[PDB]
């Protein structure tokens, strides 16, 4: 059902070189599989556990403990808008309303075309330039609710 690619296995083993215990590469292995496939599927837990020599219970517990290791399928781009206190003061709620009214989804949902997945995140460490958003790898600061329909059109 699930088969790790050769590049994934080589990256996992090269990560395992860096640590005293091969269990210490579990987060990086999950991130490698997630970067290759968008999310970590069910058979990936057993594949990573077989590569690392630790039980699949611990790999599953690590994958479900960390919020940025997606254990459910996501869209092609994961929008992550900041929830925290400074972006609350600067008005992230307008940004959230603009994103919901443009994508027609609630947070934690995916659009019908699979293009975007809306997610609230914790503080992005960019509080003096808030409100802040993170599309897949790019941080967008100084957000305004009128800039959302233009900023979501450069992520096809």
């Amino acid at each position: 059902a699930f088969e790790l690619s050769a590049a994934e296995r080589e990256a996992i083993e090269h990560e395992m070189h860096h640590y005293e215990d091969p269990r210490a590469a579990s987060i990086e292995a999950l991130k490698i599989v997630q970067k290759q496939r968008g999310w970590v599927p069910d058979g990936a837990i057993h594949a990573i556990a077989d590569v690392l020599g630790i039980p699949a219970s611990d790999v599953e517990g690590v994958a479900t403990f960390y919020s940025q290791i997606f254990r459910q399928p996501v869209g092609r781009h994961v929008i992550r808008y900041c929830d925290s206190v400074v972006c609350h003061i600067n008005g992230y709620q307008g940004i959230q309303a603009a994103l919901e009214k443009k994508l027609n989804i609630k947070p934690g949902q995916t659009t019908f075309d699979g293009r975007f997945t809306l997610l609230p995140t914790c503080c992005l460490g960019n509080c003096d330039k808030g409100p802040n958003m993170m599309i897949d790898e790019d941080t967008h600061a100084h957000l305004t609710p009128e800039a959302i329909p233009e900023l979501l059109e450069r992520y096809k």
Partner: protein, 442 residues
Amino acid sequence: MKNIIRTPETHPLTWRLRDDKQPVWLDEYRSKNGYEGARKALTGLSPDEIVNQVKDAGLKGRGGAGFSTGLKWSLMPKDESMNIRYLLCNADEMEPGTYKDRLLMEQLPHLLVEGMLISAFALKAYRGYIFLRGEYIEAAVNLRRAIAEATEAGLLGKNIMGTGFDFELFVHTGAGRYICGEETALINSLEGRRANPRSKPPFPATSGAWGKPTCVNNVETLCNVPAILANGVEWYQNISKSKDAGTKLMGFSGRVKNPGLWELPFGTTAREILEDYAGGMRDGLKFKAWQPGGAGTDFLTEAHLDLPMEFESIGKAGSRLGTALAMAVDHEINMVSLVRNLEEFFARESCGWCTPCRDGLPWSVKILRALERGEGQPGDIETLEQLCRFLGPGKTFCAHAPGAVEPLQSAIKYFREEFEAGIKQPFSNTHLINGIQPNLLK
């Protein structure tokens, strides 16, 4: 205050920043007196001499708690059979309202690399890990590039500066949990486990990463180290006439005219930060509250704005200095909704290990949602106060929940009117059962 000249004597952390906010690379860094402290350390100082020098300089932990770094370094064991030591840089920085490490590792990554080199030589640590949050993409890129440049230039790897000291530096990008910044939970996450914290004692100085001795230090502390070792102890104690030596990255955020981050000596009052550096509040906004050091600290009022930003002065005011990145709450911000947002963050960033945080922060979140909707009932404010009391220091496994309930108790103490205005319904958690007469407690 636009007229900020950043001399190396008064601004040791940010004097070599560039105007265009591009990172300073290895040639530019060494041009501006780079790796001089590392050279002095590795060519003319014993590791215990560096530990004593850092202890005499009075360098405290810039991660919020303010513990002395020399005392932390001196607590590593003296046994020579333990030589698999680890030095960890806590680059997680997940606290809401904290953005200093992002600036430090995006624009001066070689400063962090040199500080880790000096600290690893002092601690006799054979390996070093930068535990960095997974959202700092540019910080990760710049740190990996700076590590590659320092390795190619002979500043990392085997036989550094001809001394024979071997030090390997890695960058470990996390997967997004706030509790991973806790040092024992940082160690647990570095080992590839669920980032539940550990009870202390044993401290990581004797039993840390993979059982080996480990020293966890913040980004800013290790950025403070090379200036200490390149200019001396006397310069570091003669830049501020306060009990907290050295300079600190402070700054005000949130509906001020100039939100940002500036390197200031300790003893600088929060009022002059807010008015001269942050420019005061914006047009048509009135200052009603502020948090001195991030999301985990007590709210303070306008009367507390004249206190010097020190550990002892803010500690006597009922709050903590924290990360010293203050956040200003204007009059338009409802305190109940703000504290609801804070407690929602703190509740969902719980690790689930211990009962008071795991099952007593959601209760406060639901109470604050009810008070925000105008659906509060009598008993709610007293339940919030008892939650603040029984989630204090020593009642939970780690310090996530005491810092969680600090804004809650400070807001109930100062702005009790908004919480009391949330209460509108009579108390009831029981429906009527037809054939049974209820016991009417008075």
